[PDB]
Short mmCIF file of C-alpha atoms and ligand atoms in Angstrom, two decimals:
data_model
loop_
_atom_site.label_atom_id
_atom_site.label_comp_id
_atom_site.label_asym_id
_atom_site.label_seq_id
_atom_site.Cartn_x
_atom_site.Cartn_y
_atom_site.Cartn_z
CA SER A 677 22.17 6.63 -0.62
CA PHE A 678 24.05 4.54 1.92
CA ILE A 679 27.37 6.18 1.06
CA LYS A 680 25.75 9.61 1.55
CA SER A 681 24.54 8.45 4.98
CA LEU A 682 28.11 7.46 5.89
CA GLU A 683 29.50 10.77 4.71
CA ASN A 684 26.86 12.62 6.74
CA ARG A 685 27.98 11.07 10.04
CA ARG A 686 30.55 13.31 11.70
CA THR A 687 32.03 14.08 15.09
CA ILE A 688 30.02 16.97 16.53
CA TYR A 689 31.27 18.40 19.81
CA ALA A 690 28.82 21.31 20.09
CA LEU A 691 25.65 19.52 21.13
CA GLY A 692 22.37 20.69 22.62
CA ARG A 693 18.99 19.37 23.73
CA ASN A 694 16.77 20.56 20.88
CA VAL A 695 15.50 17.02 20.25
CA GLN A 696 11.93 16.74 19.01
CA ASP A 697 11.02 13.07 19.33
CA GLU A 698 12.93 11.18 21.97
CA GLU A 699 10.90 7.97 21.45
CA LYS A 700 11.92 7.91 17.79
CA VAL A 701 15.56 8.39 18.74
CA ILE A 702 15.44 5.42 21.13
CA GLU A 703 13.68 3.27 18.51
CA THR A 704 16.38 4.12 15.99
CA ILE A 705 19.23 3.35 18.39
CA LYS A 706 17.71 -0.06 19.08
CA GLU A 707 17.19 -0.81 15.38
CA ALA A 708 20.78 0.13 14.50
CA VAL A 709 22.12 -2.35 17.07
CA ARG A 710 19.53 -5.00 16.18
CA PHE A 711 20.52 -5.06 12.52
CA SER A 712 24.30 -5.06 13.14
CA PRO A 713 26.16 -8.31 12.51
CA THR A 714 28.13 -10.14 15.23
CA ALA A 715 30.25 -13.29 15.22
CA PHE A 716 27.99 -16.35 15.47
CA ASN A 717 25.04 -13.98 15.85
CA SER A 718 26.29 -13.70 19.44
CA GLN A 719 24.82 -10.20 19.90
CA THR A 720 27.27 -9.34 22.68
CA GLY A 721 26.58 -5.60 22.68
CA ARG A 722 24.73 -3.99 25.59
CA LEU A 723 23.55 -0.39 25.86
CA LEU A 724 22.74 1.99 28.67
CA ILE A 725 20.96 5.03 27.22
CA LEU A 726 20.93 8.08 29.49
CA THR A 727 18.94 11.28 29.03
CA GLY A 728 17.59 14.01 31.29
CA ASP A 729 18.56 13.72 34.96
CA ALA A 730 20.61 10.60 34.27
CA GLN A 731 22.64 12.47 31.65
CA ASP A 732 23.42 15.24 34.17
CA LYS A 733 24.34 12.66 36.80
CA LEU A 734 26.78 10.75 34.60
CA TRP A 735 28.88 13.81 33.86
CA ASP A 736 28.53 15.82 37.08
CA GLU A 737 28.52 13.03 39.64
CA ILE A 738 30.60 10.28 38.01
CA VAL A 739 32.96 11.44 35.24
CA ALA A 740 34.02 14.76 36.78
CA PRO A 741 34.93 13.44 40.26
CA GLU A 742 36.60 10.31 38.84
CA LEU A 743 38.74 12.52 36.59
CA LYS A 744 39.56 15.01 39.35
CA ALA A 745 40.55 12.20 41.71
CA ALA A 746 42.64 10.52 39.01
CA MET A 747 44.45 13.74 38.09
CA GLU A 748 45.43 14.41 41.71
CA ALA A 749 47.36 11.13 41.62
CA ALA A 750 35.29 22.39 30.75
CA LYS A 751 35.14 19.91 27.89
CA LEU A 752 32.99 18.05 30.40
CA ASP A 753 30.45 20.87 30.41
CA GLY A 754 30.21 20.35 26.65
CA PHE A 755 29.40 16.67 27.08
CA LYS A 756 26.88 17.35 29.86
CA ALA A 757 25.09 19.94 27.69
CA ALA A 758 24.16 17.23 25.17
CA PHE A 759 20.76 15.51 25.20
CA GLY A 760 22.18 12.18 26.30
CA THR A 761 24.89 9.55 26.35
CA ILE A 762 24.81 5.98 25.03
CA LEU A 763 27.17 3.73 26.96
CA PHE A 764 28.29 0.72 24.92
CA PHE A 765 29.29 -2.49 26.69
CA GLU A 766 30.30 -5.99 25.63
CA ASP A 767 28.88 -8.90 27.65
CA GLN A 768 31.89 -10.90 28.84
CA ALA A 769 29.71 -13.76 30.10
CA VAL A 770 28.68 -14.49 26.52
CA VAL A 771 32.25 -14.17 25.25
CA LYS A 772 33.38 -16.60 27.97
CA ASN A 773 30.62 -19.08 27.13
CA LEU A 774 31.60 -19.00 23.45
CA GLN A 775 35.24 -19.60 24.37
CA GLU A 776 34.11 -22.66 26.34
CA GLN A 777 31.66 -24.05 23.78
CA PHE A 778 34.01 -23.60 20.83
CA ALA A 779 37.48 -23.92 22.35
CA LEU A 780 38.78 -23.95 18.78
CA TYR A 781 38.16 -20.20 18.43
CA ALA A 782 38.75 -19.19 22.06
CA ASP A 783 41.30 -16.50 21.15
CA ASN A 784 39.03 -15.11 18.43
CA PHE A 785 35.92 -14.30 20.45
CA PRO A 786 37.42 -11.40 22.41
CA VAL A 787 38.69 -9.91 19.12
CA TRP A 788 35.34 -10.36 17.38
CA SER A 789 33.58 -8.81 20.38
CA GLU A 790 35.81 -5.74 20.15
CA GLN A 791 35.04 -5.48 16.43
CA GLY A 792 31.35 -5.85 17.29
CA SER A 793 31.55 -2.91 19.67
CA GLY A 794 33.01 -0.77 16.90
CA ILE A 795 30.29 -1.99 14.55
CA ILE A 796 27.28 -1.17 16.72
CA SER A 797 28.82 2.14 17.85
CA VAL A 798 29.17 3.53 14.33
CA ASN A 799 25.84 2.12 13.15
CA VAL A 800 24.07 3.95 15.99
CA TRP A 801 26.20 7.07 15.36
CA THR A 802 25.24 7.07 11.69
CA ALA A 803 21.57 6.35 12.41
CA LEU A 804 21.47 9.35 14.76
CA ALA A 805 23.04 11.56 12.09
CA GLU A 806 20.29 10.49 9.69
CA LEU A 807 17.80 11.89 12.23
CA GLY A 808 19.70 15.19 12.09
CA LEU A 809 21.35 14.68 15.48
CA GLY A 810 25.07 14.94 16.12
CA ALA A 811 27.29 12.83 18.33
CA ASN A 812 30.83 12.27 19.49
CA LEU A 813 32.49 9.15 20.89
CA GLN A 814 34.39 9.27 24.19
CA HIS A 815 36.41 6.79 26.23
CA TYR A 816 36.35 7.41 29.97
CA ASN A 817 36.48 3.67 30.52
CA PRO A 818 37.89 1.96 32.53
CA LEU A 819 37.97 4.87 35.00
CA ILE A 820 34.17 5.27 35.34
CA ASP A 821 33.20 1.58 34.97
CA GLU A 822 32.51 0.72 38.61
CA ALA A 823 30.57 3.91 39.38
CA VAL A 824 28.41 3.42 36.29
CA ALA A 825 27.76 -0.22 37.15
CA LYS A 826 26.72 0.71 40.70
CA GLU A 827 24.52 3.68 39.80
CA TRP A 828 22.47 1.84 37.16
CA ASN A 829 22.76 -1.62 38.72
CA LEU A 830 24.46 -3.20 35.72
CA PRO A 831 25.73 -6.79 35.57
CA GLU A 832 29.40 -7.27 36.38
CA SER A 833 29.79 -9.02 33.02
CA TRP A 834 29.06 -5.81 31.07
CA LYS A 835 32.44 -4.40 30.00
CA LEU A 836 32.28 -0.70 29.13
CA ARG A 837 33.85 0.13 25.75
CA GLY A 838 32.67 3.59 24.68
CA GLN A 839 30.32 6.50 25.39
CA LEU A 840 28.49 8.12 22.49
CA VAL A 841 27.36 11.61 23.48
CA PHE A 842 24.49 12.86 21.32
CA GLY A 843 22.10 15.76 20.82
CA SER A 844 21.11 18.63 18.55
CA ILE A 845 23.82 20.05 16.30
CA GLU A 846 24.82 23.50 17.54
CA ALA A 847 27.91 23.98 15.38
CA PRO A 848 29.24 22.22 12.28
CA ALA A 849 31.91 19.54 12.23
CA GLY A 850 35.50 20.61 11.68
CA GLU A 851 37.70 19.97 8.64
CA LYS A 852 38.80 16.41 7.95
CA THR A 853 41.48 15.04 5.66
CA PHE A 854 41.80 11.68 3.91
CA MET A 855 44.83 9.55 3.04
CA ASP A 856 45.94 8.86 -0.52
CA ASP A 857 43.88 5.97 -1.96
CA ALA A 858 47.12 4.53 -3.34
CA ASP A 859 48.46 3.95 0.17
CA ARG A 860 45.52 1.87 1.45
CA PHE A 861 43.80 0.17 -1.51
CA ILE A 862 45.38 -2.44 -3.75
CA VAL A 863 43.29 -3.98 -6.53
CA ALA A 864 44.42 -7.16 -8.29
CA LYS A 865 42.79 -9.16 -11.09
CA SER B 1121 16.47 4.67 4.82
CA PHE B 1122 19.71 3.94 6.64
CA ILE B 1123 18.04 1.39 8.91
CA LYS B 1124 16.62 -0.36 5.82
CA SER B 1125 20.14 -0.48 4.37
CA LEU B 1126 21.40 -2.14 7.56
CA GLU B 1127 18.59 -4.68 7.53
CA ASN B 1128 19.32 -5.47 3.88
CA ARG B 1129 22.92 -6.52 4.60
CA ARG B 1130 23.05 -10.26 5.24
CA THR B 1131 25.46 -13.17 5.15
CA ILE B 1132 25.13 -14.76 1.72
CA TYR B 1133 27.09 -17.96 1.17
CA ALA B 1134 25.77 -18.80 -2.31
CA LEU B 1135 27.66 -16.31 -4.44
CA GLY B 1136 28.32 -16.03 -8.16
CA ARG B 1137 30.01 -13.78 -10.70
CA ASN B 1138 27.01 -12.09 -12.30
CA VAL B 1139 28.43 -8.63 -11.55
CA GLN B 1140 27.58 -5.92 -14.06
CA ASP B 1141 29.86 -3.00 -13.23
CA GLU B 1142 33.08 -3.94 -11.50
CA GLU B 1143 34.41 -0.35 -11.57
CA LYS B 1144 31.36 0.84 -9.64
CA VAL B 1145 31.85 -1.92 -7.07
CA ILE B 1146 35.47 -0.88 -6.49
CA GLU B 1147 34.46 2.80 -6.22
CA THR B 1148 31.84 1.90 -3.63
CA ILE B 1149 34.24 -0.22 -1.57
CA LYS B 1150 36.70 2.67 -1.45
CA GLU B 1151 34.00 5.19 -0.50
CA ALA B 1152 32.71 2.99 2.34
CA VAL B 1153 36.19 2.81 3.88
CA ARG B 1154 36.92 6.49 3.19
CA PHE B 1155 33.87 7.68 5.09
CA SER B 1156 34.34 5.34 8.07
CA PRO B 1157 35.55 6.90 11.32
CA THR B 1158 38.80 5.85 13.05
CA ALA B 1159 40.48 6.91 16.28
CA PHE B 1160 42.38 10.17 15.73
CA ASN B 1161 41.45 9.93 12.06
CA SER B 1162 44.30 7.40 11.95
CA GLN B 1163 42.80 5.53 8.96
CA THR B 1164 44.63 2.31 9.82
CA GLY B 1165 42.61 0.07 7.52
CA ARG B 1166 44.20 -1.40 4.39
CA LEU B 1167 42.49 -3.41 1.66
CA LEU B 1168 43.56 -5.94 -0.93
CA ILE B 1169 40.71 -6.42 -3.42
CA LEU B 1170 40.96 -9.60 -5.50
CA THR B 1171 38.86 -10.54 -8.52
CA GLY B 1172 39.30 -12.77 -11.56
CA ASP B 1173 42.52 -14.79 -11.66
CA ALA B 1174 43.61 -13.39 -8.29
CA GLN B 1175 40.36 -14.60 -6.72
CA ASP B 1176 40.96 -18.12 -8.06
CA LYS B 1177 44.56 -18.04 -6.85
CA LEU B 1178 43.72 -17.01 -3.29
CA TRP B 1179 41.40 -19.95 -2.73
CA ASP B 1180 43.02 -22.66 -4.88
CA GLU B 1181 46.69 -21.88 -4.33
CA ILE B 1182 46.78 -20.33 -0.84
CA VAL B 1183 43.80 -21.14 1.40
CA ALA B 1184 43.27 -24.76 0.31
CA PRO B 1185 46.89 -25.94 0.70
CA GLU B 1186 47.38 -24.00 3.95
CA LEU B 1187 44.26 -25.67 5.36
CA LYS B 1188 45.21 -29.14 4.11
CA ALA B 1189 48.71 -28.79 5.57
CA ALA B 1190 47.33 -27.51 8.87
CA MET B 1191 44.78 -30.33 9.16
CA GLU B 1192 47.44 -33.00 8.64
CA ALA B 1193 49.12 -31.71 11.81
CA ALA B 1194 34.04 -28.01 -0.43
CA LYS B 1195 32.99 -24.86 1.41
CA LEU B 1196 36.14 -23.55 -0.25
CA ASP B 1197 34.65 -24.16 -3.69
CA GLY B 1198 31.78 -21.92 -2.57
CA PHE B 1199 34.16 -19.10 -1.68
CA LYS B 1200 36.16 -19.49 -4.90
CA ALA B 1201 32.95 -19.33 -6.98
CA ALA B 1202 32.32 -15.76 -5.79
CA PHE B 1203 33.33 -12.72 -7.85
CA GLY B 1204 36.04 -11.67 -5.43
CA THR B 1205 37.47 -11.32 -1.96
CA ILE B 1206 38.31 -8.17 0.00
CA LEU B 1207 41.11 -8.77 2.48
CA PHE B 1208 41.02 -6.33 5.39
CA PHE B 1209 44.25 -5.44 7.20
CA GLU B 1210 45.24 -3.04 9.98
CA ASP B 1211 48.54 -1.17 9.56
CA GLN B 1212 50.59 -1.95 12.66
CA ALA B 1213 53.23 0.65 11.80
CA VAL B 1214 50.63 3.38 12.29
CA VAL B 1215 49.34 1.80 15.50
CA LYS B 1216 52.94 1.63 16.80
CA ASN B 1217 53.62 5.25 15.87
CA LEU B 1218 50.47 6.36 17.70
CA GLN B 1219 51.52 4.38 20.78
CA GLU B 1220 54.85 6.23 20.68
CA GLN B 1221 53.49 9.72 20.00
CA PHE B 1222 50.73 9.49 22.61
CA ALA B 1223 52.14 7.12 25.23
CA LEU B 1224 49.14 8.09 27.36
CA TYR B 1225 46.82 5.97 25.20
CA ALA B 1226 49.31 3.26 24.19
CA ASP B 1227 47.05 0.41 25.34
CA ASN B 1228 44.03 1.93 23.58
CA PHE B 1229 45.34 2.11 20.02
CA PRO B 1230 45.39 -1.65 19.37
CA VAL B 1231 41.80 -1.85 20.69
CA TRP B 1232 40.62 1.09 18.59
CA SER B 1233 42.33 -0.42 15.53
CA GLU B 1234 40.43 -3.68 16.05
CA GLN B 1235 37.18 -1.72 16.35
CA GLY B 1236 38.16 0.15 13.17
CA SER B 1237 38.55 -3.12 11.30
CA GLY B 1238 35.04 -4.14 12.33
CA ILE B 1239 33.77 -0.72 11.28
CA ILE B 1240 35.19 -0.66 7.76
CA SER B 1241 34.32 -4.34 7.20
CA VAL B 1242 30.60 -3.87 7.85
CA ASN B 1243 30.42 -0.53 6.05
CA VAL B 1244 31.84 -2.16 2.90
CA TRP B 1245 29.58 -5.22 3.43
CA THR B 1246 26.51 -2.99 3.67
CA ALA B 1247 27.56 -0.83 0.72
CA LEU B 1248 27.90 -3.96 -1.43
CA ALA B 1249 24.44 -5.12 -0.36
CA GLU B 1250 23.04 -1.77 -1.49
CA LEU B 1251 24.45 -2.58 -4.95
CA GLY B 1252 22.51 -5.86 -4.84
CA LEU B 1253 25.61 -7.97 -4.20
CA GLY B 1254 25.96 -10.47 -1.38
CA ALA B 1255 28.93 -11.21 0.83
CA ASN B 1256 30.16 -13.28 3.72
CA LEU B 1257 33.01 -12.65 6.17
CA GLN B 1258 35.68 -15.29 6.76
CA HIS B 1259 38.72 -15.60 9.03
CA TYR B 1260 41.52 -17.73 7.62
CA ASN B 1261 44.01 -15.43 9.30
CA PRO B 1262 46.61 -15.93 10.70
CA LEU B 1263 47.10 -19.15 8.71
CA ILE B 1264 47.22 -17.53 5.24
CA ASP B 1265 48.93 -14.25 6.24
CA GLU B 1266 52.46 -14.95 5.02
CA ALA B 1267 51.40 -16.48 1.69
CA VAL B 1268 49.10 -13.54 0.99
CA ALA B 1269 51.81 -11.03 1.88
CA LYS B 1270 54.30 -12.76 -0.43
CA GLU B 1271 51.96 -13.23 -3.39
CA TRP B 1272 50.77 -9.61 -3.52
CA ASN B 1273 53.96 -8.06 -2.11
CA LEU B 1274 52.28 -6.49 0.90
CA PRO B 1275 54.08 -4.60 3.67
CA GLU B 1276 54.98 -6.64 6.74
CA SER B 1277 53.10 -4.07 8.84
CA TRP B 1278 49.73 -5.01 7.30
CA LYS B 1279 48.02 -7.34 9.79
CA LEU B 1280 45.28 -9.45 8.19
CA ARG B 1281 41.97 -9.32 10.09
CA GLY B 1282 39.21 -10.61 7.80
CA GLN B 1283 38.25 -11.69 4.28
CA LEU B 1284 34.96 -10.49 2.83
CA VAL B 1285 33.91 -12.78 -0.02
CA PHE B 1286 31.46 -11.10 -2.39
CA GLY B 1287 29.50 -11.60 -5.59
CA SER B 1288 26.05 -12.02 -7.11
CA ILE B 1289 23.35 -13.45 -4.84
CA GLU B 1290 22.50 -16.99 -5.95
CA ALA B 1291 20.38 -18.00 -2.97
CA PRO B 1292 18.72 -16.05 -0.14
CA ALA B 1293 20.10 -15.61 3.35
CA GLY B 1294 19.00 -18.05 6.03
CA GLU B 1295 16.77 -17.40 9.03
CA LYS B 1296 18.11 -15.18 11.81
CA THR B 1297 16.90 -14.61 15.34
CA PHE B 1298 17.25 -11.63 17.66
CA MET B 1299 17.63 -11.38 21.44
CA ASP B 1300 15.01 -9.85 23.71
CA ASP B 1301 15.40 -6.04 23.73
CA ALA B 1302 14.98 -6.16 27.51
CA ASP B 1303 18.22 -8.11 27.90
CA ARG B 1304 20.47 -5.64 26.03
CA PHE B 1305 18.93 -2.15 26.21
CA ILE B 1306 18.45 -0.14 29.39
CA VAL B 1307 16.98 3.36 29.14
CA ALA B 1308 17.22 5.79 32.07
CA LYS B 1309 15.97 9.37 32.42
C1 FMN C 1968 37.17 3.56 17.64
C2 FMN C 1968 37.11 5.08 17.77
C3 FMN C 1968 37.53 5.68 18.87
C4 FMN C 1968 37.48 7.20 18.96
N1 FMN C 1968 37.94 7.88 20.23
C5 FMN C 1968 37.63 9.11 20.41
C6 FMN C 1968 37.76 9.73 21.73
O1 FMN C 1968 38.05 9.07 22.67
N2 FMN C 1968 37.44 11.06 21.89
C7 FMN C 1968 36.97 11.86 20.79
O2 FMN C 1968 36.69 13.01 20.92
N3 FMN C 1968 36.84 11.22 19.43
C8 FMN C 1968 37.15 9.95 19.27
N4 FMN C 1968 37.00 9.37 18.01
C9 FMN C 1968 36.50 10.18 16.91
C10 FMN C 1968 37.50 10.19 15.77
O3 FMN C 1968 38.56 11.05 16.07
C11 FMN C 1968 36.77 10.67 14.51
O4 FMN C 1968 35.81 9.68 14.20
C12 FMN C 1968 37.76 10.89 13.37
O5 FMN C 1968 38.59 11.98 13.65
C13 FMN C 1968 37.03 11.18 12.06
O6 FMN C 1968 36.24 12.33 12.22
P1 FMN C 1968 34.62 12.20 11.98
O7 FMN C 1968 34.00 11.29 13.19
O8 FMN C 1968 34.05 13.71 12.01
O9 FMN C 1968 34.40 11.51 10.69
C14 FMN C 1968 37.03 7.93 17.93
C15 FMN C 1968 36.54 7.23 16.68
C16 FMN C 1968 36.58 5.91 16.60
C17 FMN C 1968 36.05 5.20 15.35
C1 FMN C 1969 33.25 -9.77 13.61
C2 FMN C 1969 32.54 -10.87 12.82
C3 FMN C 1969 33.13 -12.03 12.58
C4 FMN C 1969 32.38 -13.10 11.81
N1 FMN C 1969 33.06 -14.42 11.52
C5 FMN C 1969 32.55 -15.19 10.64
C6 FMN C 1969 33.32 -16.31 10.08
O1 FMN C 1969 34.47 -16.44 10.37
N2 FMN C 1969 32.74 -17.13 9.15
C7 FMN C 1969 31.38 -16.93 8.71
O2 FMN C 1969 30.87 -17.65 7.90
N3 FMN C 1969 30.60 -15.79 9.27
C8 FMN C 1969 31.14 -14.99 10.17
N4 FMN C 1969 30.41 -13.92 10.67
C9 FMN C 1969 29.05 -13.71 10.19
C10 FMN C 1969 28.07 -13.73 11.36
O3 FMN C 1969 27.85 -15.05 11.76
C11 FMN C 1969 26.77 -13.09 10.87
O4 FMN C 1969 27.06 -11.73 10.62
C12 FMN C 1969 25.67 -13.25 11.93
O5 FMN C 1969 25.30 -14.60 12.05
C13 FMN C 1969 24.42 -12.46 11.56
O6 FMN C 1969 23.95 -12.91 10.32
P1 FMN C 1969 23.84 -11.82 9.09
O7 FMN C 1969 25.36 -11.41 8.64
O8 FMN C 1969 23.05 -12.58 7.90
O9 FMN C 1969 23.13 -10.62 9.59
C14 FMN C 1969 31.12 -12.89 11.39
C15 FMN C 1969 30.46 -11.56 11.66
C16 FMN C 1969 31.11 -10.62 12.32
C17 FMN C 1969 30.46 -9.26 12.56
O1 RLM C 1970 38.49 -19.77 9.05
C1 RLM C 1970 37.27 -19.94 9.67
C2 RLM C 1970 36.24 -20.60 9.02
C3 RLM C 1970 35.02 -20.77 9.65
C4 RLM C 1970 34.82 -20.27 10.92
N1 RLM C 1970 33.56 -20.46 11.56
C5 RLM C 1970 32.67 -19.39 11.87
C6 RLM C 1970 31.35 -19.45 11.41
C7 RLM C 1970 30.48 -18.42 11.73
CL1 RLM C 1970 28.84 -18.42 11.18
C8 RLM C 1970 30.92 -17.36 12.49
O2 RLM C 1970 30.04 -16.36 12.82
C9 RLM C 1970 32.21 -17.30 12.98
CL2 RLM C 1970 32.66 -15.93 13.94
C10 RLM C 1970 33.09 -18.32 12.67
C11 RLM C 1970 35.85 -19.61 11.58
C12 RLM C 1970 37.08 -19.45 10.95
O1 RLM C 1971 38.71 9.83 27.96
C1 RLM C 1971 39.34 10.31 26.84
C2 RLM C 1971 39.16 11.64 26.47
C3 RLM C 1971 39.80 12.13 25.34
C4 RLM C 1971 40.60 11.30 24.58
N1 RLM C 1971 41.26 11.83 23.42
C5 RLM C 1971 40.95 11.41 22.09
C6 RLM C 1971 40.61 12.38 21.15
C7 RLM C 1971 40.33 12.00 19.85
CL1 RLM C 1971 39.90 13.14 18.63
C8 RLM C 1971 40.39 10.66 19.51
O2 RLM C 1971 40.13 10.29 18.22
C9 RLM C 1971 40.75 9.69 20.42
CL2 RLM C 1971 40.81 8.04 19.89
C10 RLM C 1971 41.03 10.07 21.73
C11 RLM C 1971 40.78 9.97 24.95
C12 RLM C 1971 40.15 9.48 26.08
#
């Protein structure tokens, strides 16, 4: 069931590279984004999908130095050890064009774009889990933005929002609690 | 499959009240939100689920007058005709507390909350579609916020983000196009 698929998606930090069919994984990532809704069917999400040498490079040559340099003013090995990383962006050129075309909803489009990033991120995350792969979602933006844009020659208008690290599950998810229903759902007739 | 479930979710404007098991619908809405991820497991989403008389009241006694009064400074019948409306909020008290506890990520929590609203909205939307029900997502916030808060005695800290109108499917979804893969997915090895 769909609810079972949602329940099956979890944050998995212990990731490896025991991935059998990388083509199928890419196809599934694309499909999850394709079938996600966005305001005005604006489809503002953009993805950079890194595996292999590019995966090593992101973590060793971009994230680590950026962090070290920032601090001066480990967990990273765990991210690098994964099969890959999906970097999620939102295309600001499209958001800007929507603000111009429909000045009525100018303030809304940035909000709806942010919601859209959440939407495609979890749809991909859940689709990967259905393949038996684990993932975790990181946020080393805005620190790594410029280096990522330069290395993979990305448009300036792509605004980095999240990095979904994914791979084979090497240890189970931890415990998770849930709020009291009564504190977040009200039903009225 | 999960991808099939995503593809099955569509915007349906022609909605009715031919809903067989309202308890099951409510259970499914709750489960979809429960199993959605949020930053720090903060679970900031809040829902007001309106059916029956409350559904009529929202559209006839709140949305319509607020709109008419705003304009002075139809489609609504189509929304009213649905079985119900799920109003999605984000609890600002929790966001504020997170900003205080982890001042390091103060700027992030509002963003992650917005993403979370997108996340739970589409998970519920898709779960409803799996039950054979249709829905559409509206945004009459912030115009109706105060009236909604007063009528259903909601906490001030609940910030209205979206209204998912749902019910039986009375006409099929319209045509939808998709961007070129090449313009939104980059794969690197
Ligand atoms: C919008 C968003 C931002 C998140 N940020 C991070 C993060 O930066 N680093 C991290 O390790 N997990 C992050 N998480 C993961 C959440 O902590 C996790 O989803 C939550 O604790 C529920 O656990 P689960 O994913 O196993 O269901 C984020 C999740 C969401 C939805
Ligand atoms: C964040 C968000 C905001 C949306 N805002 C509205 C809206 O205010 N009114 C409306 O009728 N549809 C709205 N939509 C519906 C989109 O236009 C619709 O999802 C998109 O055109 C794709 O069509 P589909 O839902 O049939 O897949 C919104 C969708 C999303 C994800
Ligand atoms: O209260 C509102 C009523 C109608 C709209 N118009 C609208 C219509 C569509 Cl199809 C959208 O995807 C979006 Cl984001 C907005 C926006 C706000
Ligand atoms: O670059 C970053 C690395 C680690 C964090 N910490 C963090 C850790 C968890 Cl479990 C979260 O749910 C969130 Cl939202 C943030 C935040 C940003």
